[PDB]
Amino acid sequence: ADVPAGVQLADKQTLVRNNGSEVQSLDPHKIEGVPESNVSRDLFEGLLISDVEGHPSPGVAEKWENKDFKVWTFHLRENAKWSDGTPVTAHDFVYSWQRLADPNTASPYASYLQYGHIANIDDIIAGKKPATDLGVKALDDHTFEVTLSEPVPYFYKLLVHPSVSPVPKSAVEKFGDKWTQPANIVTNGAYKLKNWVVNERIVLERNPQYWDNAKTVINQVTYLPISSEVTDVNRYRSGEIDMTYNNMPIELFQKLKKEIPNEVRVDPYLCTYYYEINNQKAPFNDVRVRTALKLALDRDIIVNKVKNQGDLPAYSYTPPYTDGAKLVEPEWFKWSQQKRNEEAKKLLAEAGFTADKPLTFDLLYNTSDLHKKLAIAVASIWKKNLGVNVNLENQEWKTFLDTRHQGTFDVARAGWCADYNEPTSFLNTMLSDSSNNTAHYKSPAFDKLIADTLKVADDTQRSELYAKAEQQLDKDSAIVPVYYYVNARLVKPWVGGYTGKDPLDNIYVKNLYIIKH
């Protein structure tokens, strides 16, 4: 943290953050969500990290070079250490990226190495080559070299994500799935794990071995698993919580802006809220059905009447304000809702649905006040505008994500936030073979457009191809875009260091501090 001249620090430097749900895991290779990543940034540090405004900055690597954007060489700081006092080396990164690539680890982020195009990853994912063939090597203990199969100019931006953080081989091997328990875990970020009570709290304490430990201010941070946004705001206003999770309750938000305006932080956020359709399951494998659901949803009602929290109606998957996005707004989005409804009802009638045999399906959402109220409104809207019946189903976060990967669903509430600020951070998740493709969408035309983006050496042609890929996704109605999120949360006046300037919201508790109050 960089404490401004003159601020008086509180005597007790502790923080309580709500984290939206119980994490899937603390293992960097077994996670894919925001709550998981929130805890991961405090515990495990990769090659680079985001600074307080979101810029990619030195992490374990203090400096790096690239040759033709294909061979990237990272110089690791000599004093980077694990919480047991042992050095973090380039060998730790070799082992870790191999474990991420290995099919036996079954990481949801195995395709992150395809997104960066590390040499040989496709054959490794498909089991044709061993993970030791991955294009990474330790040139010495403090030098990690990555070789890609084609130039990737934004490659370093991917490196702040948890999936490419190091994991301690000795603990993983000796303890297996229990390596992340407090007694066994070894970490290299600013904090160490003190307590992990499932569905109660995660407590982190400062890691004295962290290389930048002298600049860490907060001594202990607790992460809570509260999925009710109303309850989170209640425990923030009672004094227990210092920073809520950034999902806000419909019940109280309007009230909050007028009662405590200075605590309500609302900033840009590169995330998209959408209904994910399972594209491989009839009748959702019919584009007419998917288009009808997309058009009949009334975004103005949801975004402006039901939610009204500053979100913008969405017509794409990649947010239009992503760095490099130059998207073409489709004609259906400019139409009136009445015209969208007619087209939708027409496509459904063409699809074979009638009043006698209506379209009836499930709408899965993870437990949440926000998601439940929005799914009840969407169910109503679809019933009124299109005559479809939906059965709402809630599941806790970890189970919800597993359900989506299994494909044991019809339509699911969904949200993707960028991992690096560039359109492929969204677009690569819709590639046929992506480990993050929970839409189960497979389009050779879409895959080809994205493959062609690194076959050109021009950001204008790249942007044009990203626009065309969005148009292909839209023409196939792979998803139902609803709105582009804003990052809205409550932060007590005494929490210093949270700028809100990073549109990826990659907060590190090592950057915050408590002002005397």
- Cα separation, 514 vs 7, in Å, equals 10
- Cα separation, 189 vs 181, in Å, equals 16
Closest CA to 217 of 510, 498, 517: 510
List of residues 6+ apart from 461 with CB closer than 8 A: none
Instruction: Tell which residues of the chain come right before a gap with C–N over 2.5 A.
Output: none
Query: What single-letter DSSP state applies at residue 76?
Result: E
Give the residue from 168, 185, 215 where a domain finishes: 168
- Cα separation, 446 vs 435, in Å, equals 16
Judge whether 25 and 36 are in contact, CB under 8 Å.
yes
For residues 23 and 108, membership in a common domain is answered with no
The CATH number covering residue 29 comes to 3.40.190.10
Pairing of strands 264-277, 312-313: unpaired
Resolution in A: 1.8
For residues 340 and 244, membership in a common domain is answered with no
For residues 110 and 188, membership in a common domain is answered with no
The CATH number covering residue 89 comes to 3.90.76.10
454 alpha-carbon distance from chain centroid: 23
The number of distinct structural domains making up the chain is 3
- Cα separation, 412 vs 274, in Å, equals 9
For residues 84 and 183, membership in a common domain is answered with no
The beta strand positions in 19-79, using DSSP E, are: 48-50, 56-58, 61-67, 71-76
For residues 515 and 447, membership in a common domain is answered with no
Query: What single-letter DSSP state applies at residue 214?
Result: G
Judge whether 499 and 1 are in contact, CB under 8 Å.
no
DSSP 224-253: E----HHHHHHHHHTTS-SB--S---TTTH
Closest CA to 43 of 185, 183, 144: 185
- Cα separation, 153 vs 422, in Å, equals 11
For residues 465 and 359, membership in a common domain is answered with yes
Residue with tokens 């994910």: 276
Pairing of strands 360-366, 389-395: parallel
Give the residue from 147, 168, 189 where a domain finishes: 168
Task: Answer left, alpha or beta for residue 308, where phi above 0 means left and psi between -120 and 50 means alpha.
Answer: left
For residues 482 and 500, membership in a common domain is answered with no
For residues 190 and 265, membership in a common domain is answered with yes
For residues 63 and 135, membership in a common domain is answered with yes
Pairing of strands 360-366, 411-417: parallel
The CATH number covering residue 442 comes to 3.10.105.10
DSSP 404-455: HHHT--SEEEEEEE-SSSSTHHHHGGGSTT-TT--S----HHHHHHHHHTTS
Closest CA to 505 of 438, 415, 399: 415
Residue type (1 letter), 226: I
Method: X-ray
Residue with tokens 């005397």: 516
For residues 164 and 90, membership in a common domain is answered with yes
For residues 202 and 224, membership in a common domain is answered with yes
What are the structure tokens assigned to 138, written together? Answer: 């330790």
Judge whether 222 and 15 are in contact, CB under 8 Å.
yes
* Torsion angle, alpha carbons of 226, 228, 234, 239, to 10: 10
Per-residue exposure over 212-229, b if at least 16 CB sit within 10 Å of its own CB, e if not: beeebbbebbbbbbbbbb
For residues 478 and 497, membership in a common domain is answered with no
Per-residue exposure over 502-513, b if at least 16 CB sit within 10 Å of its own CB, e if not: bbbbbbbbbbbb
Judge whether 278 and 440 are in contact, CB under 8 Å.
yes
Binning the chain into helix, strand and coil, the percentages to the nearest 5 are 35, 20, 45
- Return the CA Rg of the chain: 23
- Cα separation, 420 vs 343, in Å, equals 37
- Cα separation, 112 vs 428, in Å, equals 9
DSSP 123-166: HHHTTSS-GGGSSEEEEETTEEEEEBSS--TTHHHHTTSGGGS-
Give the residue from 139, 168, 197 where a domain finishes: 168
- 266's enclosing H/E stretch is strand 264-277
Judge whether 322 and 484 are in contact, CB under 8 Å.
no
Per-residue exposure over 136-149, b if at least 16 CB sit within 10 Å of its own CB, e if not: bebeeebebbbbbb
List of residues 6+ apart from 125 with CB closer than 8 A: 101, 103, 110, 111, 114, 433, 435
Query: What single-letter DSSP state applies at residue 30?
Result: G
CA distances for 412 relative to 378, 384, 483, angstroms: 12, 20, 15
Closest CA to 12 of 153, 187, 219: 219
DSSP 171-184: HHHHHGGGTTSTTT
- Cα separation, 218 vs 495, in Å, equals 10
Q: Give residue 120's domain range.
A: 45-168
